[PDB]
Amino acid sequence: SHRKFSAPRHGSLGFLPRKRSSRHRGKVKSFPKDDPSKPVHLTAFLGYKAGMTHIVREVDRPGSKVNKKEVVEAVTIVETPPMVVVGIVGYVETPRGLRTFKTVFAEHISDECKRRFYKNWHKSKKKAFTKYCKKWQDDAGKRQLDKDFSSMKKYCQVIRVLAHTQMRLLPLRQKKAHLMEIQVNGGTVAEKLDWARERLEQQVPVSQVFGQDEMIDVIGVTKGKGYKGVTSRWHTKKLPRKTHRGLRKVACIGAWHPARVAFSVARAGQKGYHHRTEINKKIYKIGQGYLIKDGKLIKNNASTDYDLSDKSINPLGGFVHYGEVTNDFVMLKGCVVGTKKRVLTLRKSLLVQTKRRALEKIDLKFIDTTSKFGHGRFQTVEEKKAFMGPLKKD
Amino acid sequence: AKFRISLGLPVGAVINCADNTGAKNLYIISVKGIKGRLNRLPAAGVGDMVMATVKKGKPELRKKVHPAVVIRQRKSYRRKDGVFLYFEDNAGVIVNNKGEMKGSAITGPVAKECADLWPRIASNAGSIA
RNA sequence: CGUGCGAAUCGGUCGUCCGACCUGGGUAUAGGGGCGAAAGACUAAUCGAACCAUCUAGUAGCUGGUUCCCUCCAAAGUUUCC
RNA sequence: UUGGUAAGCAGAACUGGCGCUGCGGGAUGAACCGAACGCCGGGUUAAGGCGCCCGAUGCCGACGCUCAUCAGACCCCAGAAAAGGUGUUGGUUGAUAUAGACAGCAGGAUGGUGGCCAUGGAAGUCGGAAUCCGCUAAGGAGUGUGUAACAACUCACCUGCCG
RNA sequence: AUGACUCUCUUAAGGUAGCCAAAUGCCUCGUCAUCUAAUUAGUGACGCGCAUGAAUGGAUGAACGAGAUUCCCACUGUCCCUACCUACUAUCCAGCGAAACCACAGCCAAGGGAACGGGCUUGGCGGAAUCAGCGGGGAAAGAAGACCCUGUUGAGCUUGACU
RNA sequence: UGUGGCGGCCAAGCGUUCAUAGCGACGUCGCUUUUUGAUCCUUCGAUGUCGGCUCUUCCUAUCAUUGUGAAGCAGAAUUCACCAAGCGUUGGAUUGUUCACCCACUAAUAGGGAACGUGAGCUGGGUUUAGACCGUCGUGAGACAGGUUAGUUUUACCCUACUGAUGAUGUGUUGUUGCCAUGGUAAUCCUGCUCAGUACGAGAGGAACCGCAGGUUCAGACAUUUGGUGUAUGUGCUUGGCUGAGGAGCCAAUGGGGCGAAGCUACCAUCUGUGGGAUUAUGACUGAACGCCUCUAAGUCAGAAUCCCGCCCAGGCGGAACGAUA
Known part of the structure; x- marks a missing residue:
């Protein structure tokens, strides 16, 4: 006998192995598909979640009732010190998949990157890549090496690069810089590898991977939340107040006979810290860091064209629970996964993007700095003194 | 729209x-x-078009259902522009099925989402929002 | 609480509270018997007939059980009268 | 073989089982098919089998039938018909043909007559029983479509090409 | 339509005041009126009353009620739709440390079978040892079914059963 | 499997005519087990026995939507059939309901199974113990598918199952980056403008695509802004007591009360939700069988909420390529 009236159901039945993710950095499960027509470029990159604030813009979309009017849309701030290549890595095509073929490293690998090979840097003689480099300046290691760069040049078809972050430049406690494979999509593998080598030990900035007003996809790990109940985890109906042993439950587990209990049904357990891949997050501006010149330091990030004050995206008292943002940044409309301080893999889209809500070019008119630690009313410290006069300290 | x-x-x-x-x-x-x-208990807000019973007035009208419209509200509703806006009361008029009023004028303001939407109230209006 | 603190408790809310009120001591009523503002209530954790010993190992066309091996033969549920 | 729509339902005749009974076979199991047993060596068998699971066709085994966008594969046994087919395949009866059939592609398809009884009309065409000849190579007192009556257009039956 | 009136069979008389779809009316969610947007509900009349009716009591009524029932103003996490906080446990550690229950045990399909198998048959399959939860399954535990039937087994009640 | 439920064959006639658009008298072949019956095979040293609360899966005999054929289809609509069970199928009054009937919204408010799904999940409102009152029966103890009032819902710490958390196995020890076998699976429906007061229609009425702009229903996140919490016991007030008294505060199982950072958090705040292949109905190109035709017999085309791979989630008693190696 049957269900008297119908509903729909509680939760998504693809996402269901609701376990605490095996990895702490978002894995890219799938990069795009290349076409030898277009020139070389990296695909992915690395940032850190540092904040959230307002904007204000004057909108064009002909048709709707918000045309040439001024909305406010919200944003996140992702901080992006430019990344440093240290190697290449070749993959081959097969009938059991994609076997990894040969790996090489640069002569000079930093100590934030010699920090990525250890569980303990305190006791260890830091001996990784000590015998390896050696090869890069003897006349019997220019040939063996370029035997092999001439072996990828034949056999391999997929080519990738490898880049360590820069945690000498972030305001965090830690010092262990993230190694991350990245696909290089473009010309025939000959060209693809003429470009790579040439970049070992160089810096690659965010101007080069991404551009303004783009549609990127955002990969990471969730804000975690503890072994939580069935009412918080799955979003069921509470029970009515008279129930003998509790009312934040499912009251019927299963029927009598197919006498098991099915993975379909909702249960207690761990809430959050899953892995997750949201899409189609826009880019409203790519920021510039604190460049010094001619004595003075220049720090106008937030300076829009429509108010030209001296301020950077940084708010009064700093961003909360994080730091100050000096290094060049990207400004995402909408919210993104993870806590503050947590590391956020980027990516292009797979899907070739033409609608109208894609091709919408953006320029802004306001960017928020009023302290988030409280309930702010002042845009910049100097403006305060001017409103308030001198205090009993002066 | x-x-x-x-x-x-x-x-x-x-x-x-x-x-x-x-x-x-x-x-x-x-x-x-x-x-x-x-x-789920079905709910209306500003501008929506409710179905309505009158509960104390001119005996003529009591007992029967007319279509009403909502005009001011007590719940807080955010316009695109940035602001949260809210009124003193919950305020609405009695409408025939096609969208035209029953009274001559309105004792108060109207909300401009509900002075935008309808083509037959904004010209009765006291003061739009 | 419900393998409890309790073989009927404890908590918040509740009914009466100068009158057929509410309690200590001494005393009369004893089992087809007592007592009952009357529910078959109460009569030492027992009540539409209390408890202790005997007659008693009370009787059962009905349940349950019924202890070492090999050798040989091997049935009946149908007929009258209760 | 009696009651009951029927029941893995109630009830009786003859013989043989099961209960008390294991053994080959029917994947599976009281009753169905083979055979009834002290402990074992050779031999041949019953009923059933012979791709692998699994002993045995790993035969130059015979002649036919059948395609399924829900095929078929064994006594009791465990899935079902009235009604239909221009799939293909055997069979039975009787007509159309070198005197020129069967396609197809062309030319005719009449008057007395609008045949009489009914009905506001029955020109052949709801309807009713009756249902003829002058002409011929051939044209029926009529095969259907169409109208208030028709008009107007087919088909019964014959002709040229074709073999 | 309606029946003031008239007869006719019957018993010890044959229901007189009042009072109803009730704490009492089968048909029944009786039907006109009232309260709701909508009412097997509540209340105001109508009596045909299966089986209303006068100390076996009838009809009424101020006060009263931890008694049964309806609707309006107040107020609310009872709901739309759930959030967060605090106290004590639960959790982890040292010291002390019991119970119920237990053929043997413990992954599924379908098949037969005392007709709803964890063990049999055919398939799917099977990778030490374990911490927190849950309440599908063990036709879970708990008590020689309290219902029904039998027994030539009893008791508590009652009269025209027998003594 | 009689009664119930559902469906076929034959065709007198209904249909202005015309048996078959849409129906189906006399008759007759069946299917189902969401109706009650039949019977008693299993359970009496016990399978907890009415209906609502909550949750999942299946069927389909298709109520919506997708894809098409027929109408007695001019357009709007309405009716019969096909593939199709992808995705939904709601809020209220009287009643204990299973059933029934009315209000309103709607793409639509199709039907069923799962021990008549579901009491160591709840509720006990009904039935079906012991108190009490009537209305029929009996001289009576007593009795009512005649009505009423009040009447205690026990256990989990063992196995499994399901959800999560440590670990096990191999390549010499250990660490870095990765591939993907097999499992899991996601998005859905609807207005407005525009076409257009156009096609069609003698009138009344009244369509469609491509292109815009929003919306529901479901899913996955998030806290800049509004909203909720508040024992930072953070700082204003304030009542009763208490240290002789002012300044400094304490007890009243958080004293009350006012505004409140951080963190948690809500369609009560904002953010995102998607690409290709083979083919079902069906409609078709060449073309036989069968001198003519013919979607079919051999050959060739288009084709869809279905199906399957991917996008996404988890990663095997499955590998790989790289550095240090006491």
């Missing part, structure tokens, strides 16, 4: 009236346009 709102007038509320019919109370029996879900 109509943007959405943050809504608070579900079934069996009593909003007061803002026309000169001989109607104080309006009582919402259901909302027009709504489809469903198990256990």
Whole structure:
């Protein structure tokens, strides 16, 4: 006998192995598909979640009732010190998949990157890549090496690069810089590898991977939340107040006979810290860091064209629970996964993007700095003194 | 076309009236346009078009269902522009099925989402929002 | 609480509270018997007939059980009268 | 073989089982098919089998039938018909043909007559029983479509090409 | 339509005051009126009353009620739709440390079978040892079914059963 | 499997005519087990026995939507059939309901199974113990598918199952980056403008695509802004007591009360939700069988909420390529 009236159901039945993710950095499960027509470029990159604030813009979309009017849309701030290549890595095509073929490293690998090979840097003689480099300046290691760069040049078809972050430049406690494979999509593998080598030990900035007003996809790990109940985890109906042993439950587990209990049904357990891949997050501006010149330091990030004050995206008292943002940044409309301080893999889209809500070019008119630690009313410290006069300290 | 709102007038509320019919109370029996879900109480807000019983007025009108419209609200609703906006009361008029008023004028303001939407109230209006 | 603190408790909310009120001591009523503002209530954790010993190992066309091996033969549920 | 629509239902005649009984076979199991047993060596068998699971066709085994966008594969046994087919395949009866059939592609398809009884009309065409000849190579007192009556257009039956 | 009136069979008389779809009316969610947007509900009349009716008591009524029932103003997490906080446990550690229950045990399909198998048959399959939860399954535990039937087994009640 | 439920064959006639658009008298072949019956095979040293609360899966005999054929289809609509069970199928009054009937909204408010799904999940409102009152029966103890009032819902710490958390196995020890076998699976429906007061229609009425702009229903996140919490016991007030008294505060199982950072958090705040292949109905190109035709017999085309791979989630008693190696 049957269900008297119908509903729909509680939760998504693809996402269901609701376990605490095996990895702490978002894995890219799938990069795009290349076409030898277009020139070389990296695909992915690395940032850190540092904040959230307002904007204000004057909108064009002909048709709707918000045309040439001024909305406010919200944003996140992702901080992006430019990344440093240290190697290449070749993959081959097969009938059991994609076997990894040969790996090489640069002569000079930093100590934030010699920090990525250890569980303990305190006791260890830091001996990784000590015998390896050696090869890069003897006349019997220019040939063996370029035997092999001439072996990828034949056999391999997929080519990738490898880049360590820069945690000498972030305001965090830690010092262990993230190694991350990245696909290089473009010309025939000959060209693809003429470009790579040439970049070992160089810096690659965010101007080069991404551009303004783009549609990127955002990969990471969730804000975690503890072994939580069935009412918080799955979003069921509470029970009515008279129930003998509790009312934040499912009251019927299963029927009598197919006498098991099915993975379909909702249960207690761990809430959050899953892995997750949201899409189609826009880019409203790519920021510039604190460049010094001619004595003075220049720090106008937030300076829009429509108010030209001296301020950077940084708010009064700093961003909360994080730091100050000096290094060049990207400004995402909408919210993104993870806590503050947590590391956020980027990516292009797979899907070739033409609608109208894609091709919408953006320029802004306001960017928020009023302290988030409280309930702010002042845009910049100097403006305060001017409103308030001198205090009993002066 | 109509943007959405943050809504608070579900079934069996009593909003007061803002026309000169001989109607104080309006009582919402259901909302027009709504489809469903198990256990959800169907609700209207500003600009929506309710179905309504009058509860104390000119005996003429009491006992029967007329279509009403909502005009001011007590729930807070965010316009695109940035602001949260809210009123003193819950205020609405008695309408025939096609969208035209029953009273001559309105005792108060109107909300401009509900002075935008309708083609037959904004010219009765006291002061739009 | 419900393998409890309790073989009927404890908590918040409750009914009466100068009158057929509410309690200590001494005393009369004893089992087809007592007592009952009357529910078959109460009569030492027992009540539409209390408890202790005997007659007693009371009787059962009905349940349950019924202890070492090999050798040989091997049935009946149908007929009258209760 | 009696009651009951029927029941893995109630009830009786003859013989043989099961209960008390294991053994080959029917994947599976009281009753169905083979055979009834002290402990074992050779031999041949019953009923059933012979791709692998699994002993045995790993035969130059015979002649036919059948395609399924829900095929078929064994006594009791465990899935079902009235009604239909221009799939293909055997069979039975009787007509159309070198005197020129069967396609197809062309030319005719009449008057007395609008045949009489009914009905507001029955020109052949709801309807009723009756249902003829002058002409011929051939044209029926009529095969259908169409109208208030028709008109107007087919087909019964014959002709040229074709073999 | 309606029946003031008239007869006719019957018993010890044959229901007189009042009072109803009730704490009492089968048909029944009786039907006119009242309260709701909508009412097997509540209340105001109508009596045909299966089986209303006068100390076996009838009809009424101020006060009263931890008694049964309906609707309006107040107020609310009872609901739309759930959030967060605090106290004590639960959790982890040292010291002390019991119970119920237990053929043997413990992953599924379908098949037969005392007709709803964890063990049999055919398939799917099977990778030490364990911490927190849950309440599908063990036709879970708990008590020689309290219902029904039998027994030539009893008791408590009652009269025209027998003594 | 009689009664119930559902469906076929034959065709007198209904249909202005015309048996078959849409129906189906006399008759007759069946299917189902969401109706009650039949019977008693299993359970009496016990399978907890009415209906609502909550949750999942299946069927389909298709109520919506997708894809098409027929109408007695001019357009709007309405009716019969096909593939199709992808995705939904709601809020209220009287009643204990299973059933019934009315209000309103709607793309639509199709039907069923799962021990008549579901009491160591709840509720006990009904039935079906012991108190009490009537209305029929009996001289009576007593009796009522005649009605009423009040009447205690026990256990989990063992196995499994399901959800999560440590670990096990191999390549010499250990660490870095990765591939993907097999499992899991996601998005859905609807207005407005425009076409257009156009096609069609002698009137009344009244369509469609491509292109815009929003919306529901479901899913996955998030806290800049509104909203909720508040024992930072953070700082204003304030009542009763208490240290002789002012300044400094304490007890009243958080004293009350006012505004409140951080963190948690809500369609009560904002953010995102998607690409290709083979083919079902069906409609078709060449073309036989069968001198003519013919979607079919051999050959060739288009084709869809279905199906399957991917996008996404988890990663095997499955590998790989790289550095240090006491």
